[PDB]
Design a protein around this ligand. Sequence first.
Ligand code: BMQ
Ligand code: BMQ
Lengths: 218, 217
Amino acid sequence: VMDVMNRLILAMDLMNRDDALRVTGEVREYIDTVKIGYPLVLSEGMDIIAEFRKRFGCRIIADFKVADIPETNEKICRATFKAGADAIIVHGFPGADSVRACLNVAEEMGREVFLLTEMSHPGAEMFIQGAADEIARMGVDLGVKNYVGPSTRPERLSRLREIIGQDSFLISPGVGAQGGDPGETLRFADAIIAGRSIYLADNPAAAAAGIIESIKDL
Amino acid sequence: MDVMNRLILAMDLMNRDDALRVTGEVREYIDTVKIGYPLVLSEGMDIIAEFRKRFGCRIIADFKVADIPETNEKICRATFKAGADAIIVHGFPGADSVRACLNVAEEMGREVFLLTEMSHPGAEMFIQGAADEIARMGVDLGVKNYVGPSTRPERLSRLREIIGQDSFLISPGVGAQGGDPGETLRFADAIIAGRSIYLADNPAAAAAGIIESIKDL
Ligand SMILES: O=C1CC(=O)N([C@@H]2O[C@H](COP(=O)(O)O)[C@@H](O)[C@H]2O)C(=O)N1
Ligand SMILES: O=C1CC(=O)N([C@@H]2O[C@H](COP(=O)(O)O)[C@@H](O)[C@H]2O)C(=O)N1
């Protein structure tokens, strides 16, 4: 599994190139794994992945929550890995064939797929939560090794960890701004994801250091 | 919206030159183009403005938005800043995530299309069972534009029943995936066609053929 420094992943959702680069560089000594999503990619282009690789020694997780039909999913994954992303996050709710399409591309291109099971926001309770356990089980059956689960629902994150087993890799967003606790989340997740609590802080470096200090014993 | 010939081109080619050439070859038949991540992630968001500059076409950004509210807002803003007239959003993530998109769309003078049930086999696993409820949610939220599957006419018909005749419904899965143009238009206002057009030996003749088959519609 990827070795995430300090078990902390930066969710870089700033939409300005200059700000995104500044903040990421300021926390570089604390984080070596950055999650880049569509807010930044659709604002600055896929070349932003290339720029991050060039400027920082950071792994890149493309949080694109791939959720299309198999044929389109394959194209999205190909373009994303071609750009330099180490891994891509895919939704499981669209079904097994859609996930398999991503796994196949990742396999042939030498990259990784992260399967998003349950989400952290309130709306996730409407449809996603009820299908989450099965989505996770489907991932295990498909050979998925990396997963994404909600920090905002400890009980659910715990169950997801059980389903995927201790050997699987699990990252969890919702820490900070959404209310998730770093320490509690790390009881089940291999790494936590933090966005606003870091990039909107007056001193992003101090914010990252603070999070790490609170989980030093872990 | 008034979609020429009730036919929307799904431009999923991943090369700027080919995407532009093919779209130009069928411009006389279509005035509405659906641009998704295959093209955008390969050529950049600037491709949207280029389409509006070269063609007199509406642009539907098929990004199947499926994040938390906060992120959905940012995605919609970036998408509309690029010139997209509408954006397609997943309903599965819940009402708050859809509302986030509706807010930005209202702010920038754009439309939100709610994707209920999908057209591929995998849609039967989780999406299909929640589709009717997702459509009802759209109705409760005031959504007026929807996306339903050409591959399952009975399901597409049910979606139409839920949203009513006033709502606008577009449907993918025609051609390559097996959907029939004419049958799909019994329920959808417009059909979406990708590969059956852009991968055909003669894209223009392909588009012309589809239109000829639905001439009476
Ligand atoms: O269930 C999920 C999945 C996910 O990826 N995310 C993402 O994780 C990040 C959370 O950022 P923040 O720490 O709340 O600012 C954002 O990039 C979200 O899009 C989430 O918040 N919940
Ligand atoms: O249920 C759905 C939703 C959707 O947008 N699409 C999209 O519609 C297009 C269908 O293209 P094609 O005609 O099968 O080549 C693609 O861009 C898909 O990503 C789909 O096929 N099924």
